[PDB]
Amino acid sequence: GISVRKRVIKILRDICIEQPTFPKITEMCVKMIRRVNDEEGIKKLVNETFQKLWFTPTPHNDKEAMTRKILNITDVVAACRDTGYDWFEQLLQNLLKSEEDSSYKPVKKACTQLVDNLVEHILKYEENSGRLVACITTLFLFSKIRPQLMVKHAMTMQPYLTTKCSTQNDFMVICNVAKILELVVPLMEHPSETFLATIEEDLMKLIIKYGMTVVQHCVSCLGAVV
DNA sequence: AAAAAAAAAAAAAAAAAAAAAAAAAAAAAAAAAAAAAAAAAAAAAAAAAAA
DNA sequence: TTTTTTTTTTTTTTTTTTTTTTTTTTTTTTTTTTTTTTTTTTTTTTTTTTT
């Protein structure tokens, strides 16, 4: 039906607003993102619900609550990583595209603040690694949907690319950061040539030391940058 | 004796028209939510008048 | 100069109306069947005409 859908989603919104730290939050987010493309009215309501639940300007005070929301989003994505990313990406298309006009640009500021604050969290991380790779993966998705949001920090992302370990999650770091570089390098405003030099050098160094899929997904980036 | 060609009514046959019916879809109505607009009211500000 | 009084603007609340959405019900044009009538065509005998 179309009634029942609206009613159950209303109940879910009240649940996720009122008494957080309930266990089943993540799954609720997974199901609601699963239903983003089904209809029209449902689409409008989920769009406005997600615009008020996460992507709000979040003024620069009480940063701990903001970090807790960040924890929420990272948990959601890291749990839905198994099935697929298509619904999330479609949702992101909807939220970004749906405001092409000036219209005070409410979301652009907030999203850029989410990515830079995640960068900063990554910075102070310094050394749970599942959460690290999940955050980098979230960075990857946010780059894929729109590349302008992650233009400034790629040179700061370079040191992770240089050396890493022989564990799976680390390999996921290597492939995802290569993917990000592939996505962002052509749009980077006036890069430095030595930066490209060391990029290409360690890319070859990575090729000569690791498995199949990582070699594939990095020589891809090599072809793109060349 | 012979013979050919043309008409007229009656008979068939296929296409179109006229009842008869069945089913999808447009319409209407009710409820109820969500929104929008208008009226009013409360507070803030800026000017004007007197001591 | 300062104190006291007036007026305009801004913003929030509320109430009535409007819009929306679904759902259920209804009644209508649409679609198919059957018939069946008409009209055209056909035939065959009759009539007309020719040798």
Residues 6+ apart with CB under 8 A from A25: A16, A72, A75, A76
Distance (Å, whole) CA A13 – CA A28:
9
Distance (Å, whole) CA A78 – CA A26:
9
Measured to protein CB atoms, the chain C nucleotides within 7 Å are 20-23
Nearest to A180 by CA among A214, A139, A215: A139
- Closest nucleotide to the alpha carbon of A42, via C1': C21
Our measurement of CA A134 to C1' C7, in angstroms, reads: 62
Q: Are residues A173 and A133 in contact, defined by beta-carbon separation less than 8 angstroms?
A: yes
Our measurement of CA A97 to C1' C43, in angstroms, reads: 81
Q: Where do runs of H (alpha helix) occur along chain A?
A: 3-18, 25-34, 41-53, 63-80, 86-97, 106-125, 129-145, 154-162, 168-184, 193-207, 212-225
At A25, the amino acid letter reads I
Experimental technique for the deposited model: cryo-EM
Q: Strand C neighbours with CB under 7 A?
A: A 1-4, 39-41
Distance (Å, whole) CA A151 – CA A162:
19
Secondary structure in 3-state letters for A46-92: HHHHHHHHCCCCCCCCCHHHHHHHHHHHHHHHHHHCCCCCHHHHHHH
Question: Quick one: which residue's CA is nearest to B32's C1'?
Answer: A3
Tokens of A69: 């929301």
Q: Are residues A10 and A47 in contact, defined by beta-carbon separation less than 8 angstroms?
A: no
Q: What are phi and psi of A123, to 5 degrees?
A: -60, -55
Our measurement of CA A17 to C1' B17, in angstroms, reads: 70
Nearest to A172 by CA among A211, A204, A199, A208: A211
Tokens of A5: 């859908």
Our measurement of CA A220 to C1' B47, in angstroms, reads: 73
